[PDB]
RNA sequence: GCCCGGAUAGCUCAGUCGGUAGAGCAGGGGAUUGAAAAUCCCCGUGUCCUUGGUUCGAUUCCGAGUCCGGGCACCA
RNA sequence: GGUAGCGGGCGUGGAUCCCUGGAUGUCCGAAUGGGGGAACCCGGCCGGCGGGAACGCCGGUCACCGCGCUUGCGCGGGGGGAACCUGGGGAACUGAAACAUCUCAGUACCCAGAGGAGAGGAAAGAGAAAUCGACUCCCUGAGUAGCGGCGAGCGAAAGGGGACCAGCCUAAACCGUCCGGCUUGUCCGGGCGGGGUCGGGGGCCCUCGGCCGAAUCCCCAGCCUAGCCGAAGCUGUUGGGAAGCAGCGCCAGAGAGGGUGAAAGCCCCGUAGGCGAAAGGUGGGGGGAUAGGUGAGGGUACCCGAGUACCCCGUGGUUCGUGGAGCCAUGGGGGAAUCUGGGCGGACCACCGCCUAAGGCUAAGUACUCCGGGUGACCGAUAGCGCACCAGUACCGUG
RNA sequence: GGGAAACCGAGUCCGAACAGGGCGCGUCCGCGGCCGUGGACCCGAAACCGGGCGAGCUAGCCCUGGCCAGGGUGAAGCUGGGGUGAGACCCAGUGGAGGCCCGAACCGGUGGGGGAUGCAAACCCCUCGGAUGAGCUGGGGCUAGGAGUGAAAAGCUAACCGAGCCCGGAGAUAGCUGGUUCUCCCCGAAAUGACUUUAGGGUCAGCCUCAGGCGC
RNA sequence: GGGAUGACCCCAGGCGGUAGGGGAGCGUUCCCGAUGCCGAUGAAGGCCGACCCGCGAGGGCGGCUGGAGGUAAGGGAAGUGCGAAUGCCGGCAUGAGUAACGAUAAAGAGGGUGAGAAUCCCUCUCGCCGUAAGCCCAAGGGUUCCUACGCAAUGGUCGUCAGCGUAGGGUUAGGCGGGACCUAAGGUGAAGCCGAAAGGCGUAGCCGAAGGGCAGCCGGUUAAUAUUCCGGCCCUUCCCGC
RNA sequence: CAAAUCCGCCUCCCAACAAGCUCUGCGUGGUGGGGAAGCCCGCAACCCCCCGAAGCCAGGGAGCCAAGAAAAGCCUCUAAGCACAACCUGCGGGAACCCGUACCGCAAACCGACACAGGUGGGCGGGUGCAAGAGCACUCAGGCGCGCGGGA
RNA sequence: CGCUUGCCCGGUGCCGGAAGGUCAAGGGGAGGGGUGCAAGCCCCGAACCGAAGCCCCGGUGAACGGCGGCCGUAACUAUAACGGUCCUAAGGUAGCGAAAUUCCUUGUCGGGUAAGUUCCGACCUGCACGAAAAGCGUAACGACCGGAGCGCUGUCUCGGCGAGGGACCCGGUGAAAUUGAACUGGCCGUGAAGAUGCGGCCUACCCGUGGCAGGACGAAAAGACCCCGUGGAGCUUUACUGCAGCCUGGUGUUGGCUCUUGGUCGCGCCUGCGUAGGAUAGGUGGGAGCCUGUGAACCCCCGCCUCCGGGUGGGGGGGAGGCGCCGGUGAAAUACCACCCUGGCGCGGCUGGGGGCCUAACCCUCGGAUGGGGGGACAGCGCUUGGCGGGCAGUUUGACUG
RNA sequence: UAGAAGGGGGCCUGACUGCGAGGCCUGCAAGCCGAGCAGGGGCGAAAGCCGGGCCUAGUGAACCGGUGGUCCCGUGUGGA
């Protein structure tokens, strides 16, 4: 699934199996014994964090963890209550 | 093809951190006992592969040649 | 209405009939009060009807999600569409005279989204020209340059001819205000407003002020949705019938065509030519109005889009299949600078040049044909659409 | 025009070479024959892949109901009697157990005959297996295509399953088999060789034909 | 060879033919020729001929049929010629008056009716079923129920008959069965979790029945309905008032 | 998942293969209906014995191991509330909606292209005889002779 | 159910082994190269450290599996209790045996029959039984397969008669596969080698109805069998290549405090005893002076190293003296000062391994918690490295060929 | 084939570079024989002979790579 901050989501990539010797060394070069489709995923993770009274957690790529703690800070100038951890986040840019 | 180890007594192997060439086994002479062994004394044996060079000389230290032994790859 | 028949009616006091606007429109269906085996059952609240409290009708109103403004109130969305379009996923038969890389192919297909189109789009561009100057589309370039078990095969771009013609708004410094935090400070950060948009510009300090103009609104012309006017021939004869044949005439901006008992410019409907809208659509094509935008110096060096550029690992796009492998995109790890900044010109270094990434919009030229009209060295009932006829019907299948 | 190219040019390339030697004197449209790419003369597979439709037939399990005439055998346990120091134990009576027995309904299919353009795309007659259980059965549910289910045959999954049906890719491919439509005139073959994952298929040579030229 | 090239006369040779190569023609559809030409005193198409012209494919001529179209000379395009494909569509033949007429429970006579009766109606004999071949419900079917007129077809024969044709009748509920009650497997699904899209899970809730809950018995009437209509006896809920 | 006078746990007066209060079945019951075989369509009893369920009283009893649905209606306990409400027991008068109901239904009307010798769940299924029975033979009620026939 | 289930861990599998060999990314960088005028910027790259797997050492049978040959010998002959020799991981035990296993085979004896390739009992030269793909047995059970008797019969010698439903004749209704056209005979021959159809001869007036199956190479199904096609599809494995899954090193999510050790670069101290020689000489260069109130000679208290000869560092006292050249020996000589690792200690940076304890990420739990317990930087997950991998997929497995 | 191709010695390296008229063989592509000119050599006094071996088998197209050289190309220019 997808990063709530960065918008990164799984992609398709190939998997190329080669044998043989680099041309760059010894020679003749490499042959592709096979190729298959497969997918790469974003290293994502949970970040739980304070903000107001409620708990509110984010499921974000590891590479943007910081950007959450940054968002917490710059929502210090903002009126936040209402039994709605759900709307805090929604109202959280 | 590329990177490691090695050659020393008949066999199998230990060495000065440059100045000594040494073990075990086998073979041989004797001690021995009912037989065969196991004890125990005693000796034989060298171009240290190899040609060069460092050096006061070198088995050791370094260029190089040679063969035996490993290790990892490529093959149109 | 497709009219025949009973059995009744209407109309120059202008009917039937055609165009435009409105009214009414059960039940199902995205289906939305709730339920459900689609067209059926069952409710709440407010009002109405019956003698009407129990019963039953009638009208109004009650789904969920997303955005905004004091929990209510406002805007929106949902589904369908012959092709045509963009994005996310994405085969195999086959070809290679076997097959595995390669090919068929980013094809068939699935999914989401857009609209009368869609996509793209104003240079971190092309590439070698003392060069060009957004994007799309056609003709060349060219089966060229290249890619390739260098096999089978795949296959660019620049440049030249045309079509169309258009350019714009923000982020950031700096300034003002409203609100809510803190360690109550000339402070931190949030919403508006102002400033500001570039191949060098902008901000801040000090000395000089004028046209360009909508893609937004308004008005017209024209056009679509009913219709109207239209020239000129008689007789005889053969014949079931004249439009044939014969005598004597006439029109033509009209001798396209169809019809009439056979074969007709002048009998009928038309054709050439010319007319017409109260109402609804359309509409810079032609006129008007705003919104918006236009200079120069000299100094400070405060700002120019960040987990980004950049390097490394894994992949995709391109003619490029690891190759000397750049450029453009990016899942993972590390990780800057603000113009003495940064990317590109096919590893790399140095010279010489090109361009300003990390926010957005933007007509026209192009695509398709459910729909209407025009044509045909197209078919003429085993043809042509599957259907000229009551056909996606009868009939076949659980579907 | 030569050359891989730099390049040179009526020449140019290998070469030291005024040796030798290799290559070096029209276009446009119409018409007709043949070739390449596209189904490319027409009909035909067994199969492969994609998206859907099927558990109202059949297989398993889940929820809730229903059904099994009448006979037969007689487990344990009770109660009494006996036995012993106490007991084990042994008798009678009672009692009604069980993937027990006979046999309908009901579930099944063992042997033989009939049927064989059938009454019937699995039937009929005689005979036979089970029948309180690992039992049969109605209604409501769930699992699917390299997947389900299976007391296990590769069985079943809507009258043909060693991988269902429908539509599409699609006019797959088919070195194989079949078929190919009016008339007259002139000429008229081959069934050999070489190579071929080749051997009933091909490529070159050979043998048929037409046009132009040459002329014993 | 003539050679007044005449495509006509004279002379001399060649002419079996599969795969194939080459050369000439004939016919089918459509276009120019066309605002023309033929045509009811008869177009196209159809049927006949012993006649005329062509080597032949073909083309003329004549007679009958047909009733509104046809289209030269000279040229141009192509869906252009069938006997075979276990070819495709349709029509009609052969087997042939042949095998069959769907349980071996079984028939006979007399009266009706009618154009017409082995096959319809009535009566009397005979035979077959009777944990059925009888009666009552559930599913599924969808007017087949009842009546009046009928018999072309459907019926394995016949048909005056019918589950057939035309037309009109006929299904009545507080208490029977479902729904304005309940929950079962399972399904759906607030909160909530997951997945490239499509979508997959899931607490409470909701749907879901032949299981739980729940008030009707005995008689009579129709051509065709009956715990539904009618009669006697016996019940259940709501609402208002005392 | 204390809110209870209800449940559940202790403790002690009475009371116990009972009585008492309940709730079903069958019997009877005011009275209402029905009512053969027989002639051309028609006279109005209803009593006594015997066999007897697999049905009823039903949540009955015993034995056994494999240890045998949920929820509402229905009783009771209290919450907020409310006590001029509100329930409960009689008695009177009102009110009581939607859908199905013909016919075939082991079959010629359903599944099998057919008026097909096949397939199809629940209840009733009389009498006599053969040991029993839903078995077998005949037979009640009721229904049929199977939509081609005649001769040899 | 009963009685039992022997021997072989060479090879395959699985289980155990903190050593050792091989080993990918990664760490590390001796040294090389391209370019710049250079600062630099760019490529390659050797030692060494570096997982799972593999090698290696062991275990393991109700784990895959396996369980011998040739010659000789007893006072008749026959045969061998005994013996020799080769091979193996080990050489088949008990029990059964011409068998659902036996080729030779109808083995040979016996039983049953008048006669018995079958059947039952025996014997073994078991082509080719054998212990949990169990061995030898076993009351009761069986629409299972074999061999026998008794009873009874149309099964048969060997057929007969009879019944009903069809077959046949008449009235009504009326199909089918098949079909080049047909005026459709025998024998010998002939022919693409099995003739109604050609040749010669022989037979035979025209047309039907009930019967039979020898022929029309009769009908039906574009042969399963055999080939053939560089045709298809299901199954297998130590066939090829991949993929799901599982294992594993480095990273990220990932943090505190200790102890213990590696490798590297700094520096600061040591380190060295052949023969001779004052005495324990590392090299090479410098070198005529150095040391002491920056308290020297001598003694005692005390650490470390040793070739046991000595070398060297501290503390306390004490007082004014110490060394080299020269000399002499040796290849090389001395005091003092330099760069230099031959090996070692001490603080340093720089990364890198193992042990513990913590709690605060992550995960599990607790009468529902802004909290308490438990695990804990491990586990899970992202990217990446190498391995195992018929559990799954695509395919290849030649031609000639009397 | 001894009128040496056989046996023995001396000096050598033509087991050359650049070409090659003309033919054998032949579907293709391959295989074979080769006089002669230029250059620089060996043996011989010279004539001359030598472009491996008495002769006919001892072999493998293209593709992809390795090493050593050289006139060539070198993605704006120099170099890589």
DSSP annotation string for A11-71: EEEEEEEEEEE-TTTTSSEEEEEEEEEEEE---EEEEE--SSSS--EEEEEGGGHHHHHHH
Retrieve residue A54's tokens: 């409620």
- Nearest nt (C1') from A2 Cα: E196
Distance of CA A79 to the CA centre of its chain: 29
Determine if strand C comes within 7 Å of the CB of A61: yes
d(CA A31, CA A20): 6
Retrieve residue A44's tokens: 């994502």
Determine if strand G comes within 7 Å of the CB of A53: yes
**Neighbour tally for A9: CB within 10 Å:** 12
Determine if strand E comes within 7 Å of the CB of A57: no
**Neighbour tally for A58: CB within 10 Å:** 22
- H-state helical runs in chain A: 65-73, 85-90
- CB contact at 8 A, A29 and A20: yes
Retrieve residue A72's tokens: 């917490």
Helix, strand, or coil (residue A10)? coil
Resolution of the coordinates, Å: 3.4
């Amino acid at each position: 699934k997808v990063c709530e901050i960065s918008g990164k989501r799984p992609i398709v990539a190939n998997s190329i199996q080669r044998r043989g010797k680099a041309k760059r060394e010894g020679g003749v070069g490499k042959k592709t014994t096979g190729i298959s489709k497969r997918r790469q995923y974003p290293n994502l993770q949970k970040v739980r964090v304070r903000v107001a009274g409620q708990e509110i957690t984010f499921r974000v790529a590891a590479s943007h963890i910081p950007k959450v703690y940054e968002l917490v800070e710059r929502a210090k100038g903002l009126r936040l209550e209402g039994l709605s951890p759900k709307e805090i986040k929604k109202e959280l840019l």
